[PDB]
Structures are given as structure tokens and as C-alpha cells.
Amino acid sequence: EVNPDIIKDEVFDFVIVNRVLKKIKDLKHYDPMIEKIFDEKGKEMGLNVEIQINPEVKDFFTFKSISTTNKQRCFLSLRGETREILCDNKLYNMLLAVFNSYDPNDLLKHISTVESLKKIFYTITCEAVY
Amino acid sequence: EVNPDIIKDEVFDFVIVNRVLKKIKDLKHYDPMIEKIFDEKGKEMGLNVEIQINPEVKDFFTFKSISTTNKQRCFLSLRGETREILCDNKLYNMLLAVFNSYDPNDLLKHISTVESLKKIFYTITCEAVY
Ligand SMILES: [Cu+2]
Ligand SMILES: [Cu+2]
User: Which residues are Cu(2+)-binding (chains A, B) (predicted)?
Assistant: First the structure.
């Protein structure tokens, strides 16, 4: 609801914030759109995060995370197509690998991790145990 | 877009229709909401299917399938929560197991398969290869 802007501040009992957000050198590069959830009949509960992986083309490649009381769900968007992804350390490392490698003196490496993540994207399958 | 109603008719080059829809004894029990996709700048392309697994409580437990030119995506909804699921024969059998076991002389068996599918639901994880 109310959407703050900076994490370099108050603490949060959310993993996306401790595991990924807080370790991004330049959080602003990525247009962090971050609403906080509560005031709806409830009162201070979840966090709703959106990062642009390609801030040159809004919404071309985005990362969203919805965190609540108990659960968290993760999503990736590439070219209009959304896919949920398991929130884990594998995804986190891939996320920071991309987020923390921007550096104009090494575009090649950064773009390398970006293309690696799209690869991951097309890989996601949603499965159950039968 | 234009939403037909009956499959006991024309043929379709879509798996949801050949593998699941066409094998449901009483397709109407489940409020098949089925739009056909095309006329949008395109022209005859996809099929958009929605089945109510609990037709007593609209949208409490639903199954949706979006089929297009090449791909198909599958979704399950239980109590407001949506989760994509891999479209395969495992899901199909689970689907018909539920859809084809309605029978007032054996509510117990039917309800048995319904509860088994909710179980499956909470099991779905979305994973990539790293
Ligand atoms: Cu970049
Ligand atoms: Cu039933």
C-alpha cells in the first residue's frame, strides 16, 4: 500500500530483504518499486517488491516478490511472460550476480549474467508430487 | 474471445481438449467456461478453458488452461490462491479422476479424489535448472 523507497534503513523480517535487497550495491539502478502491505482490515503484514532487471525498457525484464506474514512468492517476467519461481539461495545468487555486476568498464561480464538469467527463465517448470 | 460451449463437436488441435475435455462424461457439471482466441489483429489461434472443480462455490476451486499456436499453460486455484502446473498426463489423470467420479451413489469416492487433488495443489513447486 504505502510505498517507501529505502531499505538502507529500518530492519525487516523478510528474506527477500535480508538475502537480496540489502546486498544490492546500487539498489536505485533498478527502480525498486516497493509497496508495504497493511491497512486493508489488516495492519502491517507483507512486503511487495518489484525490481526492473532492464531499467532501459520498463517491464521488459522484471523481478517481483510478494512477502507476507508467513509465505513469500517469487516471479520473473521476460517480454510479457510471467513465471513464478521458487524463492531460494540459488535464485538469490543469480539475482545478485546480475544486480551487482553492472559496471560500465565491464559491460561484457554484466550482460553475461543477464543472458544467463533469461536462460534460467525458459527453464522453469512447475511440478507437484503425485 | 467468442466463447462457444460444446466440444462434443468440432475437432481441435489442442491437448487439453483431446486429453481431458473430451473424456469428461458430464462436461456441463463443471461450468465449462471456454473462450476461443483470435480476432485481435490475429485470427484463430488459441483456446482459453476454465473448469469449476467445485461448482457449488464459484471460483473456490478452479482449473484453467490457456492453449495457443505452440504452447499451453495450466493453472489450479484453491481459495483465492493460483498456481501454475505442468500440463502432463499425470495432471490429466488426476483431472479426470476428479471430473469422472461424480456420482450421488458414491459421494465418498468422488470427494476422495477432490481432496487428493488439493493435496497435490499444496505440493506444486516451481523450479529451474541452474
Ligand atoms: Cu543491466
Ligand atoms: Cu464434486
Answer: 110
Where would I find the beta strands (DSSP E) of chain A? Answer: 33-37, 46-52, 61-67, 72-78, 81-85, 125-127
Resolution in A: 2.8
DSSP A47: E
For residues B64 and B105, the answer to whether their CB atoms sit within 8 Å is: no
- What is the rounded CA–CA span in Å between residue B119 and residue A63? 29
Residue A1: give its domain's CATH number: 3.40.1420.20
> Is residue A22 within 8 Å of residue A34, measured between CB atoms?
no
Chain A positions in Cβ-Cβ contact with residue B84 (cut-off 8 Å):
83-84, 126
Residue A29 assigned ligand-binding role: no
* Ligand with minimal distance to B29 CA: 2
Q: Which of B91, B120, B130 sits opposite A120 (nearest CB)?
A: B130
B126: how many CB neighbours lie within 10 A of its CB? 21
Helix (H) or strand (E) holding B114: helix B107-122
Task: Find the length of chain B.
Answer: 130
Find the chain A residues whose C-beta atoms sit closer than 8 A to any C-beta of B.
83-86, 90-91, 94, 120-121, 123-130
Per the structure, the complete domain to which residue A11 belongs is given by 1-130
Query: Among partner residues A120, A129, A130, which is closest to B128 by beta-carbon distance?
Result: A120
Element housing A113 (H / E): helix A107-122
Strand order in the sheet with A46-52: A33-37, A46-52, A61-67, A72-78, A81-85
What is the rounded CA–CA span in Å between residue B106 and residue B23?
20
Distance to chain B for A72, nearest Cα, Å: 13
